[PDB]
Symmetry: D2
């Protein structure tokens, strides 16, 4: 049951199943994976494609011949499996040069390098067919207040993204950017810490249409925020270009659990929203198989990502299609929420005694919203307890 | 020492010093205050002005004669003291009619009422000289996923704010709006939960220039965010129209402690930023004297708000003016953060071998940022330990 | 399906379904309920019993004749329905006299009053058949550091609980105490903030056997803790005398959602643990129907508490009984976790070369734990997706 | 000013100043330090001593000759400087063998190994003069519910600590154990997650007098708890055997900032408590110089730890000695908090009409606590603004 196929558009980063298990208190628990092997194993599980940071595919410091060979082998794996590469990104966080940032490093020479590194990989992303180029500015931020003037850093961040937009447009590329928020970790505070901050920033870029967000479940939950609500605001803005799916337990370090783990009900409401909104992008998993696992456990955890999406998709669809739930949604006035407040216009509102002098506030206040009955229908559907 | 005067522009809501101490587990511990008495007592402490929700000044349900009389008495107090009213707002949260929201209530008739209530108070705010009209949508949101379609609610929220902008423009008023984020409480999740989400939303209003944010220290800290960073992003966007100053200890219920309490170092960095940026708006306190206090303690806590601002202003100024700190800022490359990354242009960057093929990554990585020395200078200045 | 009956031992506080919906930003949205009516309505839903604070049953300030009459009517309702009263407690938080605490108020006369108030209600609890007397010290704590010397407050708290133990023993009562932790709200920080702190404190009481804990799902989750783990530690200590069941979304104000709402997977693991451990106490709900609801919604939300417990009980049982899961538990070495590390004794361990000089660390490190496969079996069982 | 000397008892782990800066998203930014060099540099800053994990001093896997040589060199550095070694600990977290735990690993052979590893290092700790042996069970816990039966794991944890107590007693050693709580990271949830849970656990060990806690500032703050309050409870229990000092900003990953950074007011109240209680143990820093720093910044950050302690010690002493503050403490009834509630005894309390029938609740409720004035005196003292 709940068997994924490539038509489900499930994608995985190389760095997900390839995570060796190092952590700040721990050494690797797994050997490195060849990207060719992860392409093959993901395909066999029913994935649609893979994504990469530059340095996941090509070791940092490679010669041009080494680079060609890594890319050749990867392309052969993609061709052998039918896997796609819908998204790529830059690693602007691992190398010590990026310890104060890439695009917002205090050192100008590092900012210029970060841009050159990114632009080299945009070209490769396009080679490989990617439609989206993600940017997670994990090193952009500070541990102390004097270290980083945030106005100046936002000026630098805008320059960087505007240069990248100039570049793609100069080359005639179709690729679009997706900025990935995170509130903290590895920096004490990261710039553009939530979906909202990233959306706001994009509106000040010179070509805003080229940029959207890549929200990650666990990242918004590291700020205690409602991930489905943030996704709804990104969809409302027309900016959900890509998404990272995983699990998180609240406010703590970035756990990157498999999707469905962590906050299960938020996963249900997320799937419900993506499906009802007709989101057409990749269902991408940015997760890490726990370091307790061997390779068999890596593949089990990846399979579980997809399985849980498909279970939740079935249950959300059944919820929305249930006449009893449709009834309950009307009883809770979700239909009224979707109608304009004052399509009659401002003057008409001002002249409507039913809106003020003759509004019976107590009668309106007495009306229950019937939200608990609706929510228990939702729970019953999620649990298969109807 | 650190004596405030009206020229410091310190303001207080009527509902701050007037908070009777009810909480969800507790009855009032203080009698209600007459607004006239709080105007007088605040003036005597050196405040510049006061702010109000409609229902703080005029009891809900008042007749026109009662309303005139409440306003008359308040105006006399303002005239007796020289206090100003720079901001007002609407109470769209206390009355049970607003239990599912004002502007985004599922019930359309409630949304229309909320707008009429607001517009009546805009007129009064303008009467009294207010430059800013705040909106805190504390009831906008949900406890469960099916109860609120956030796309539809954002459509309703945009209609509401666009109608308010149509109204002010129709009347020729100069007043501008400031949306106050909060992530949760009283709703399980509140819409526009952070500065970023509110900034993003404003960009989609029909007349965005009429709207900014009213960030509150404790609200961003309820999401674990860096309040000075969020203020910097609001300043970068040109949208810091007003601010609420108070204290909070992290991620928990909204504490509304006096300013300086809660996160003291964040208070220092906030003041440093407001002063270095030349923020010219009110320094408004949205706080609650703890319910342990009698009226003497109310006034002590209000005085402490202002005192702590003035202490932190002195220390931040001394930090920035210290030649030793100026030196340390250059050593940490804060000067370089403020210069353009690539004013030479994209092509020039692309053709600069110093940015890639001949960039010595290891040499750059070895350079320490010197942030800890800078931060300990900051600590020494804050503590008066230089 | 999932129909509760009194044999399931589900209990509710009067203050749960009777919550009028006041909050710190909001007035009541529901009328007060007569305890007689809530007894009747709960019984009809299949509840086993009810619990009370003194002031829920007898208005504060009642005369002896009024008190007798309130108790008479309540007893008639209990007799009419077959409902039980397994637990009672004291309200040491609503009245302004308790603004700095009951048992740890700085004012000694308040501490003495708090004790007298409690002892009066212990007598009534015993009258009504209660086996457990809960104490939630919601006002014990501080908003500022100088206000409360915690060593001195713990001395006062120990005196108070030791006096209560002297009292029950003097009267020959069988009732036992259960201390309910909470980390914050209404105080900035509450004393005994978690299960662990309360367990530790109990060990220093003069008659520790008389005292256990009453952990509440949402309270431990307000500190970001794992509620099932804390329950396991209370069970390990022999101290789970009572429990409060509800839902919470992480680190924020105390939400008191219906059980099953909030962290659904934690609810599953909680039920699994209570049932596998053979917890024999009440399954008590300390929840609040959201203030959006009318009375119909109150009863729906109460019914949902019980329904969700029963669904999760079925799924947890099925998980543990599945041979495939039993296999997976052995593959993950849960059997080995349950065997003694060194029943051979210290000397034997010291002389065992297999434990050190000849332990093959790499071979052991290579063994995967198989936890992800186990967890996806758990997920499949919870969702009814096997 | 604020110059530390060895008599201040400041200590540092080798792993603090020696942290190379690896993090889960980042490679090392600093070379490894020779322990000899850190001993020398710490001594020159005015430190009293150093602490170590086994694997900080002796590379994992060393031969007996290599081990002797590492220890010889370290002892020479200690002798050259007069530095002490008051505490040591075991690394039961870095090596992949410990991926599911040391003492509570599911694999029994790993649990036995963990014990042998610890016991070898206890012997060395004693060699070097240590009085305290810390245990931080960072790998004890789980990412999923089925992986770890917490009752069984606590049985294993108790066996392990009881075996260690048998060992020290068999050898006639004076050393005592200190269990270090942490709520999460690297495991999704860690067992014994707070001071309270560890204190409770200790009471169930066979020789409880041999065990205390080693609380860390940032760890309790990762659960949003009040660190000074938790320290007060550990002192009340007689169990503050050691402490880890650092800084943290709330609920997020373990930051390990220098002491004084993070929550500054909590640092002030902590110092106030340690000094007023006469804590006589090491003032140990478990911190990490941020990876932005070079070696000069490492030493600056270490110096700042000590400086901030000494500043806060001066300010706390001045607060407590100020007659004005002494007055304010009496006005807030801190004197009354320290007197017994009912030294007259239970019967006397029961017969005291002033405690109930003739207690004037309203008069008592009207009395303000004067906490805000007290707290602003505290703020003025901290800031040097008296
Ligand atoms: Ca889950
Ligand atoms: Ca403070
Ligand atoms: Ca749930
Ligand atoms: Ca600080
Ligand atoms: Mn992540
Ligand atoms: Mn991601
Ligand atoms: Mn607030
Ligand atoms: Mn506010
Ligand atoms: Mn609760
Ligand atoms: Mn409770
Ligand atoms: Mn730490
Ligand atoms: Mn530590």
């Amino acid at each position: 049951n709940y068997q994924p196929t490539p038509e489900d558009r499930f994608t995985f980063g190389l760095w997900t199943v390839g995570w060796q298990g190092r952590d700040p208190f721990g050494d690797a628990t797994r050997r490195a994976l060849d990207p060719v092997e992860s392409v093959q194993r993901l395909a066999e599980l029913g994935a649609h494609g893979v994504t990469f940071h530059d340095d996941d595919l090509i070791p940092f410091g490679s010669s041009d011949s080494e680079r060609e060979e890594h890319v050749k082998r990867f392309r052969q794996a993609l061709d052998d499996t039918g896997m796609k590469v819908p998204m790529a990104t830059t690693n602007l966080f691992t190398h010590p040069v990026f310890k104060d940032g890439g695009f917002t490093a205090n050192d100008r020479d590092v900012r210029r390098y970060a841009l050159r590194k990114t632009i080299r990989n945009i070209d490769l992303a396009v080679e490989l067919g990617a439609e989206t180029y993600v940017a997670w500015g994990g090193r952009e931020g500070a541990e102390s207040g004097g270290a980083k003037d945030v106005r100046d850093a936002l000026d630098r961040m805008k320059e960087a993204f505007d240069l990248l937009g100039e570049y793609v447009t100069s080359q005639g590329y179709d690729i679009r950017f997706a900025i990935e928020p995170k509130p903290n970790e590895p920096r004490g505070d990261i710039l553009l810490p939530t979906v909202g901050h990233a959306l706001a920033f994009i509106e000040r870029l010179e070509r805003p249409e080229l940029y959207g967000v890549n929200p990650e479940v666990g990242h918004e939950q590291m700020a205690g925020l409602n991930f489905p609500h943030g996704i709804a605001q990104a969809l409302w803005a027309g900016k959900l270009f890509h998404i990272d799916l995983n699990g998180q337990n609240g406010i703590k370090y970035d756990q990157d659990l498999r999707f469905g783990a962590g906050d299960l009900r938020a996963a249900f409401w997320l799937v419900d929203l993506l499906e009802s909104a007709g989101y057409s992008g990749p269902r991408h998993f940015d997760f890490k198989p726990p370091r307790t696992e061997d390779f068999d456990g890596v593949w089990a955890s990846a399979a579980g990502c997809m399985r849980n999406y498909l279970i939740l998709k079935e249950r959300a669809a059944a919820f929305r299609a249930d006449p009893e739930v449709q009834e309950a949604l009307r009883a809770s006035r979700l239909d009224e929420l979707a109608r304009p407040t004052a399509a009659d216009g401002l003057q008409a509102l001002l002249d409507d005694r039913s809106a003020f002098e003759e509004f019976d506030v107590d009668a309106a206040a007495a009306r229950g919203m019937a939200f608990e009955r609706l929510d228990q229908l939702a729970m019953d559907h999620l649990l298969g307890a109807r």
